[PDB]
Amino acid sequence: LVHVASVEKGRSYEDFQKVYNAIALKLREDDEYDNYIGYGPVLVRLAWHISGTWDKHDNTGGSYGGTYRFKKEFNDPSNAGLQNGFKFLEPIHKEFPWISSGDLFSLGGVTAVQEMQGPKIPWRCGRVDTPEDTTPDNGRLPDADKDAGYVRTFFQRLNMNDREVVALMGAHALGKTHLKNSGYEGPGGAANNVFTNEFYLNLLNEDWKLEKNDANNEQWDSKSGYMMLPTDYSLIQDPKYLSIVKEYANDQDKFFKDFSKAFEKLLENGITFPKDAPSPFIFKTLEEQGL
Numbered sequence: 001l002v003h004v005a006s007v008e009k010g011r012s013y014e015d016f017q018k019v020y021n022a023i024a025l026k027l028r029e030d031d032e033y034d035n036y037i038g039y040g041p042v043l044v045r046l047a048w049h050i051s052g053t054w055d056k057h058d059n060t061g062g063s064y065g066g067t068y069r070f071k072k073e074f075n076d077p078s079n080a081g082l083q084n085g086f087k088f089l090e091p092i093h094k095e096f097p098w099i100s101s102g103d104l105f106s107l108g109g110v111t112a113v114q115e116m117q118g119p120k121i122p123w124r125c126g127r128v129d130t131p132e133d134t135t136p137d138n139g140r141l142p143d144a145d146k147d148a149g150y151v152r153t154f155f156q157r158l159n160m161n162d163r164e165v166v167a168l169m170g171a172h173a174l175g176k177t178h179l180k181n182s183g184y185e186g187p188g189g190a191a192n193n194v195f196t197n198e199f200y201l202n203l204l205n206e207d208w209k210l211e212k213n214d215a216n217n218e219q220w221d222s223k224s225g226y227m228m229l230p231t232d233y234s235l236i237q238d239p240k241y242l243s244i245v246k247e248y249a250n251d252q253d254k255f256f257k258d259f260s261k262a263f264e265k266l267l268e269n270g271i272t273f274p275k276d277a278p279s280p281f282i283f284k285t286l287e288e289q290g291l
């Protein structure tokens with residue numbers, strides 16, 4: 001399977017910066033969602049789940065085809081709760097009907113990270129919608145009740161190494177787990193709609209307790225009202241993972257730089273860009289534009 005990026009006809013940077021601005025403006029406007037967390041966290045989880053289906057062995061899945069719009073993928077039990085992110089983006093797709101679905105879902109993740117004052121994420125356009133029969137089957141996304149060996153093996157399918165996995169997991173500082181979506185409940189820290197390295201700091205400094213929640217699943221809970229998934233706590237149980245957790249807890253700029261590289265790679269896996277394709281765009285935030 002080869003997937004060649006094809007720029008939406010006649011579009012350039014200025015067109016995609018208008019779409020970025022439309023998403024950022026609605027993120028600011030619809031601030032009441034999920035007890036005032038806002039839509040930022042569910043939009044970076046949507047960009048990760050539409051990319052996270054990729055398989056390096058046969059180049060199936062991934063963000064290219066925008067197949068989350070089809071019933072099979074939209075209804076995946078692992079995607080429970082992401083309908084809220086799709087509904088947020090639906091008015092913006094009506095306003096810019098020329099953007100492909102893969103490009104809009106991946107750009108929603110980029111916009112959310114940057115507007116929640118995370119690092120700049122370079123982004124490339126050119127994903128092309130593919131037919132319903134190219135939709136990957138359910139079951140390619142990760143379980144939360146496992147250990148470090150499972151996380152390591154799982155991310156080898158997306159060819160992410162240990163460093164890329166630990167950097168990507170720092171996004172779990174954002175938003176919260178919701179009992180009715182996943183069978184887990186609670187936030188991972190106090191700043192859950194501002195992008196920071198707090199996930200690493202909490203993992204190493206909190207006093208965690210293994211408890212059972214109302215859906216009968218075990219999770220790690222702390223005196224401060226925070227929680228961590230079994231796969232999250234994995235990162236301090238493994239010696240290789242633990243030393244990179246300590247590095248990001250002690251250097252927030254290195255965490256931002258490594259996250260940016262791994263998140264762009266996640267969103268681009270499976271796509272072939274021609275050498276006459278445009279360079280990655282770096283979008284300005286609303287704040288840098290005085291908007």
Ligand code: HEM
Nearest residue numbers: 041042045048142143144168171174175176177178181182
């Ligand atoms: C082994 C890897 C991972 C597992 C098992 C996992 C699992 C989960 C689960 C169970 C939730 C809660 C869903 C809900 O109840 O609403 C969640 C939320 C979230 N995850 Fe992951 N995740 C993984 C990796 C990642 C990565 C790599 C990213 C992003 C780069 C990410 C971003 C998020 C975000 C932002 C949320 C919060 C969503 C919200 O507030 O609505 N996750 N994760």
